[PDB]
Amino acid sequence: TTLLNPYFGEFGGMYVPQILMPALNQLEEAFVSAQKDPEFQAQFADLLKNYAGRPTALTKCQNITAGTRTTLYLKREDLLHGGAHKTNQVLGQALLAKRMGKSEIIAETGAGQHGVASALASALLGLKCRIYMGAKDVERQSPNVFRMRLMGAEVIPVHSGSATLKDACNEALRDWSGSYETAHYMLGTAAGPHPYPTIVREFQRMIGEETKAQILDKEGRLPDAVIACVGGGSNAIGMFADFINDTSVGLIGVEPGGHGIETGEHGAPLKHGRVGIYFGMKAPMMQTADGQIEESYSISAGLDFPSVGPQHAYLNSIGRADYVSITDDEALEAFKTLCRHEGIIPALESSHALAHALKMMREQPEKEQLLVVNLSGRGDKDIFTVHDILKAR
Amino acid sequence: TTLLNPYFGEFGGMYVPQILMPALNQLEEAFVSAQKDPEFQAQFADLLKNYAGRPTALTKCQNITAGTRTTLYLKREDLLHGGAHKTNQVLGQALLAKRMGKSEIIAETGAGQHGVASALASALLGLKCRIYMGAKDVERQSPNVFRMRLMGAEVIPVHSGSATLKDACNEALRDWSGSYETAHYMLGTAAGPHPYPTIVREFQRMIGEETKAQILDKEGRLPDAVIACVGGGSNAIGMFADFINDTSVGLIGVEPGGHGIETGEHGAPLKHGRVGIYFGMKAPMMQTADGQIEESYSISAGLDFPSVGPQHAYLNSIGRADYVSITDDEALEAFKTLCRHEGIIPALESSHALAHALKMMREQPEKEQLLVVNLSGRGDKDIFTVHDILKAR
Amino acid sequence: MERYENLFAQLNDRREGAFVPFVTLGDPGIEQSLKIIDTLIDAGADALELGVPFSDPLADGPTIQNANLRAFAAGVTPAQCFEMLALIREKHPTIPIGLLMYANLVFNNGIDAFYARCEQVGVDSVLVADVPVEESAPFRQAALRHNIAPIFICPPNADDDLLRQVASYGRGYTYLLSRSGVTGAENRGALPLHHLIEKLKEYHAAPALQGFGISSPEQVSAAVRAGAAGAISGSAIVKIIEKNLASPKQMLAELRSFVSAMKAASRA
Amino acid sequence: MERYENLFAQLNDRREGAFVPFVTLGDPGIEQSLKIIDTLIDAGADALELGVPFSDPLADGPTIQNANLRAFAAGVTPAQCFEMLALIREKHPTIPIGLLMYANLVFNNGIDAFYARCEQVGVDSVLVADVPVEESAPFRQAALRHNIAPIFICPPNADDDLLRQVASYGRGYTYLLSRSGVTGAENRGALPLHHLIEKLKEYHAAPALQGFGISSPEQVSAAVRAGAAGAISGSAIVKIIEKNLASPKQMLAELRSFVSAMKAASRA
Ligand SMILES: O=P(O)(O)OCCNS(=O)(=O)c1ccc(OC(F)(F)F)cc1
Ligand SMILES: O=P(O)(O)OCCNS(=O)(=O)c1ccc(OC(F)(F)F)cc1
Ligand SMILES: *Cc1c(COP(=O)(O)O)cnc(C)c1O
Ligand SMILES: *Cc1c(COP(=O)(O)O)cnc(C)c1O
Ligand SMILES: N[C@@H](Cc1c[nH]c2ccccc12)C(=O)O
Ligand SMILES: N[C@@H](Cc1c[nH]c2ccccc12)C(=O)O
Ligand SMILES: N[C@@H](Cc1c[nH]c2ccccc12)C(=O)O
Ligand SMILES: N[C@@H](Cc1c[nH]c2ccccc12)C(=O)O
Ligand SMILES: [Cl-]
Numbered sequence A, B: 001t002t003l004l005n006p007y008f009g010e011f012g013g014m015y016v017p018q019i020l021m022p023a024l025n026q027l028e029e030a031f032v033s034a035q036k037d038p039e040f041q042a043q044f045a046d047l048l049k050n051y052a053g054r055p056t057a058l059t060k061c062q063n064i065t066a067g068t069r070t071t072l073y074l075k076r077e078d079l080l081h082g083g084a085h086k087t088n089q090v091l092g093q094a095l096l097a098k099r100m101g102k103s104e105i106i107a108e109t110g111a112g113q114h115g116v117a118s119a120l121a122s123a124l125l126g127l128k129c130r131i132y133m134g135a136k137d138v139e140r141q142s143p144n145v146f147r148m149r150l151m152g153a154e155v156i157p158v159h160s161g162s163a164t165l166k167d168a169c170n171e172a173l174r175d176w177s178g179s180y181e182t183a184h185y186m187l188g189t190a191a192g193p194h195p196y197p198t199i200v201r202e203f204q205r206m207i208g209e210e211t212k213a214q215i216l217d218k219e220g221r222l223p224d225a226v227i228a229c230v231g232g233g234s235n236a237i238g239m240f241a242d243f244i245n246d247t248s249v250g251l252i253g254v255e256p257g258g259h260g261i262e263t264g265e266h267g268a269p270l271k272h273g274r275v276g277i278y279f280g281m282k283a284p285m286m287q288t289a290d291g292q293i294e295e296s297y298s299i300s301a302g303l304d305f306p307s308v309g310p311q312h313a314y315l316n317s318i319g320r321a322d323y324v325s326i327t328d329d330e331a332l333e334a335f336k337t338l339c340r341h342e343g344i345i346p347a348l349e350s351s352h353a354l355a356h357a358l359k360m361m362r363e364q365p366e367k368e369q370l371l372v373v374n375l376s377g378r379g380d381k382d383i384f385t386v387h388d389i390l391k392a393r
Numbered sequence C, D: 001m002e003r004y005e006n007l008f009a010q011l012n013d014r015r016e017g018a019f020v021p022f023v024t025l026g027d028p029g030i031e032q033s034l035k036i037i038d039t040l041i042d043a044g045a046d047a048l049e050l051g052v053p054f055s056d057p058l059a060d061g062p063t064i065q066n067a068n069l070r071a072f073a074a075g076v077t078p079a080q081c082f083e084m085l086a087l088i089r090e091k092h093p094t095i096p097i098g099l100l101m102y103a104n105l106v107f108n109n110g111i112d113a114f115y116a117r118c119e120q121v122g123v124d125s126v127l128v129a130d131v132p133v134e135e136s137a138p139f140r141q142a143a144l145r146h147n148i149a150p151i152f153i154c155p156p157n158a159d160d161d162l163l164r165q166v167a168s169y170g171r172g173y174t175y176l177l178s179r180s181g182v183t184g185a186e187n188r189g190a191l192p193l194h195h196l197i198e199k200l201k202e203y204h205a206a207p208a209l210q211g212f213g214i215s216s217p218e219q220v221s222a223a224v225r226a227g228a229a230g231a232i233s234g235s236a237i238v239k240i241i242e243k244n245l246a247s248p249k250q251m252l253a254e255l256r257s258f259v260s261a262m263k264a265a266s267r268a
């Protein structure tokens, strides 16, 4: 029995070992209680404002759209403390951990951005943080691993399965299976078993709420479309949530196309995978013909995951949201364009969303359209990756 | 000087040798006059009804959409005399030839469907017909060449350039350059120099006018979208024209993706070509880096052309119409599905439009949508092509 | 078939517990795995619990994580596992065979079709480790339609509602978890379970097998003394495979000695 | 530069017509084409009309269709044609050089940039065969900005408005079409053109060169007698190339004899 619906149509659920069901039920009850608690909301609002720096700017980008009928705004989650939107929901989940009386945090990370976000929230709020990371990701993300350790977090390499993000997801759940009476699992995206897709959406929805207020103030109307990249689904559902009932507003999610959908070297399960059951949820998966979980690929580690949150799969199925893909090369061009024409270095994740908005403009340059891209993060972290690719060309 | 605008925004024009400008001016004047002449309209309506069999059915396809919230209708141009929509506009252009006092018809053809349509209209209306066809197409289309000769038309193989459709287009214009005082050039699509894009649209617009009346009668509303394949643009603009001012109705044009856009072996210039000047028009082209006209490719000869009519390029540029592509394999699956589930053998051209509608349904099966596919032709002509591909698999 | 019901009736008539080893199918290869399983049976296994290698075994500790990886290094697929299961049943007509599955391998080509294939090869039960009772309906329904026992987990912190659910829905045996956490011999259960065992019998549950952390004969004896019908041991068995990869002969000898000792502890 | 103006003033002082051959650049290869063009000049060509091979030459009959195809079989590109044009000008400083273009090759990398490259290599005029006066504005504007003469076509059925347009917009020479149809020696013009020639002079048009179907000395003489400043011959020249592909030496000898005879017909 649950307080909230664990499903979005056919997608979602609570596909965990029986031992973990009390942990999920406890978390759901604590969340429902917290959402009705003005003191909890006030402490969350205080952290978001005075520690993380909300509200974030909404920047009109005039140089990149000059000579077209596109008006493009960027929602500047790149300016949030930590340099990505992840900070919003780790502060909320750290407060849930404290509400339940817990002292310890478990987190998974691939790119390392969630590991750093979990570590910074834990440092601020007096929680002991341990982070699981696939050994291949540890090797690739020395800077983020060092940031996590500077903030006092334990980083535990995972050597099982493919030694990457899905393997760290598994290890975090293995640990929680034996530790949930003392530790909270701070899941890094709007995916996994109920109640995480719901919690992470509600702890990211200020992105879309601020965007709505800002665009009304500046333009006197709603956007024609809001556009966000989709790794697990958190920044996109955070931007989308407050617009879902505004039926005129397009919701466009951008999956990584990697080397191209036809190559199979991509991270686009929502449109190019198959529904499966993994990481506690029924959701579109990249998987082998016989049901093993496949290796995803993107130039951007933040998008490199073989599944997607269940609310995106549901919004797609009913036609409320549309999902597209952007290749590595399209993302790299968008990265270079924003640097040169706006003086903003975007995350390569966010560059996938920008690349699709630029395509919407360039394909139909006399179409009047008011677009918002969720600039989910800053791209300082990506300049080595971009240097190496431009060098190899 | 002209009576009508030769351009759709930046696209179109009259890029012919000076010698041909009087032929285009004469044709434009005869068309403008004919459009105001009730006797001309009555003779055209009589041919369309009593000879070609208009109106064509609008068929609700319930088996292929079962278990989804898609309602799909097919506009049955496959049932028109000749088995494709081309018959509509060849009857109108034959009447224009007679209005100008001409006795001879010139036509180009690739797949041979326009050659047969021109030959049948010429046989009925007492015109001497000569058809230019690239020698490679003559070799591939023995059945259509024999049909043209049964109807008393002269078929002239073209050996210059790439010996295919663009080369036959050139040869038709070379002939007309020396013969327009006696011969009318019956151009086969909504492309080429003004006034052909305009004439061919107006002589195909009964497709969309009937569709609108039929869907209102059956559903009490307009479609959410009308979907048509794009070879040169005639069946698509014929379906689209009457809906252009109905801003709620999506207009979706489907270009051939061939072996895949990334292979370069496709016929999708509107979205994947470059604007150029060729065949009397400024329009998106497949062309080499240094401006030679490139070889297009599709499994379907009717879609295999390296350019597109200028009104489609314009409707795309302003965002009124959206253009997508469908690969050979997607078209073949749609062909097989319609045969097996509806007992209709569609043209492989039309199968590209159906494949995109099936994708709209399958991607978002709980989205409520009322779709019309223009079934531009019947696929009896394609059963050898389909047999050969299924055999080779 | 009624293979668990027949086994437990025969063991009850001898006042005897069941000893049930777990191994990963195809660890360390198909041929050696078939020899291992025949050795387990010959040495006194009453039933088997057999894992299909899966990319993401999130209820398993490192020992069984590494068994899955060895089977993958040998190219073992679920299709090859079902060929092995058919041959095990062709050799051994009465031993109950239980599978340890993860949900995606059951759902992949259709839940009903998965359980139909289990029935065709002569499997007796399926435990889907990442499907809790809340998500179990289509799995347990398909199991019962195909004469497969759906195996439910009774955790140490089970409340009365969960005990009644596991008791009603389950067949074959009830899995009595020793402890929280994941599979592993390095972690022994240190909670008495006789109260859960008594409540399960009161609610007419399938007989209980204790599992997780069982690595010694005294634990098998203790499970029976507490009122359980028997005990499952996986990691302790898999550790003997891992230790002896270089000597297939010594591997089978040590598996025989271990299973013999564990089975002796179950006898009256 | 003023190369056409200087040529026509010099010919006027000798009461002499211009003889202007056409060839396709790079037909049958780059080196042989350069030798052909030097032979045309040495044999008495007053100016040149040079085609850039194009996939779709829709103002050309089979002879020049086949010249385009031979140049493509030799891998000739527009970039290679502009290298040839630079070298022709480096050898021959005063001969007017006109290009025969199709619109896509001019538009491809930008109209302004095309005419800037023509100025850089020392071209004097451009005729874009599929751009009528109605579409000419960006072409003629770019031509004049880069000191290139835009060449306009005066058809046999030209009305007074078209004569005034061609006269006002054109520079260098006015192309006086012999006849309807496409290029070819197999089709001779059989309409008197002296009325169009007189109207063009009345409207201060660039001097007229008659072109299409000119294959014989008597036609060159007739063009001058009718008041034209000269005559252009293409297919007749290209036929000598086509006939002599196997003997480059005989090809140059026959081109020399033909151009000599055609140029002699222009002299007072
Ligand atoms: O002896 P150990 O500690 O290795 O335990 C071996 C258990 N192997 S098994 O197939 O019974 C088994 C049973 C249940 C499992 O997870 C679940 F409880 F969540 F369902 C996992 C494995
Ligand atoms: O002697 P012919 O019959 O081969 O004529 C050769 C003419 N070669 S050209 O470059 O002057 C030339 C001039 C104009 C052309 O077409 C246009 F009039 F439409 F513009 C084509 C070629
Ligand atoms: C983590 C991350 C993402 C992808 O994760 P989502 O949960 O899909 O938002 C995107 N952008 C940036 C900058 C990130 O750090
Ligand atoms: C000719 C043809 C086409 C493509 O031509 P359009 O001018 O683009 O309509 C499409 N379908 C069929 C059946 C055809 O015969
Ligand atoms: N790999 C990214 C984002 C991320 C964290 N957890 C995830 C789970 C699924 C998908 C993406 C993620 C990071 O660790 O910063
Ligand atoms: N190739 C097809 C359709 C067609 C005719 N003329 C065209 C011109 C451009 C594009 C397509 C066409 C036919 O001849 O039946
Ligand atoms: N510490 C023991 C007993 C225990 C305490 N809390 C639990 C919660 C669930 C299961 C078991 C327990 C174990 O982890 O097994
Ligand atoms: N028959 C001649 C003269 C002619 C008649 N009608 C024409 C129209 C245009 C140009 C020339 C003509 C020719 O074709 O050249
Ligand atoms: Cl459900």
Ligand SMILES: [Cl-]
Pocket (backbone or CB within 6 Å): A140, A141, A142, A143, A384
């Ligand atoms: Cl790095």
Ligand SMILES: [Cl-]
Pocket (backbone or CB within 6 Å): A250, A322
């Ligand atoms: Cl939409």
Ligand SMILES: [Cl-]
Pocket (backbone or CB within 6 Å): B007, B009, B010, B011
């Ligand atoms: Cl224009």
Ligand SMILES: [Cl-]
Pocket (backbone or CB within 6 Å): B140, B141, B142, B143, B384
């Ligand atoms: Cl055929």
Ligand SMILES: [Cl-]
Pocket (backbone or CB within 6 Å): B250, B322
């Ligand atoms: Cl739209």
Ligand SMILES: [Cl-]
Pocket (backbone or CB within 6 Å): C001, C002, C003, C004, C005, C006, C124, C149, C172
């Ligand atoms: Cl049984």
Ligand SMILES: [Cl-]
Pocket (backbone or CB within 6 Å): D001, D002, D003, D004, D005, D006, D124, D149, D172
């Ligand atoms: Cl000059």
Ligand SMILES: [Cs+]
Pocket (backbone or CB within 6 Å): A065, A066, A067, A068, A069, A070, A071
């Ligand atoms: Cs703009």
Ligand SMILES: [Cs+]
Pocket (backbone or CB within 6 Å): A224, A225, A248, A249, A250
């Ligand atoms: Cs919209």
Ligand SMILES: [Cs+]
Pocket (backbone or CB within 6 Å): A230, A231, A232, A255, A256, A267, A268, A269, A303, A304, A305, A306, A307, A308
């Ligand atoms: Cs993803």
Ligand SMILES: [Cs+]
Pocket (backbone or CB within 6 Å): B065, B066, B067, B068, B069, B070, B071
């Ligand atoms: Cs339906």
Ligand SMILES: [Cs+]
Pocket (backbone or CB within 6 Å): B224, B225, B248, B249, B250
């Ligand atoms: Cs619509």
Ligand SMILES: [Cs+]
Pocket (backbone or CB within 6 Å): B230, B231, B232, B255, B256, B267, B268, B269, B303, B304, B305, B306, B307, B308
């Ligand atoms: Cs096309």
Ligand SMILES: [Cs+]
Pocket (backbone or CB within 6 Å): C167, C168, C169, C170, C171, C204, C205, C206
């Ligand atoms: Cs039972």
Ligand SMILES: [Cs+]
Pocket (backbone or CB within 6 Å): C221, C224, C265, C266, C267, C268
């Ligand atoms: Cs005992």
Ligand SMILES: [Cs+]
Pocket (backbone or CB within 6 Å): D167, D168, D169, D170, D171, D204, D205, D206
């Ligand atoms: Cs002039």
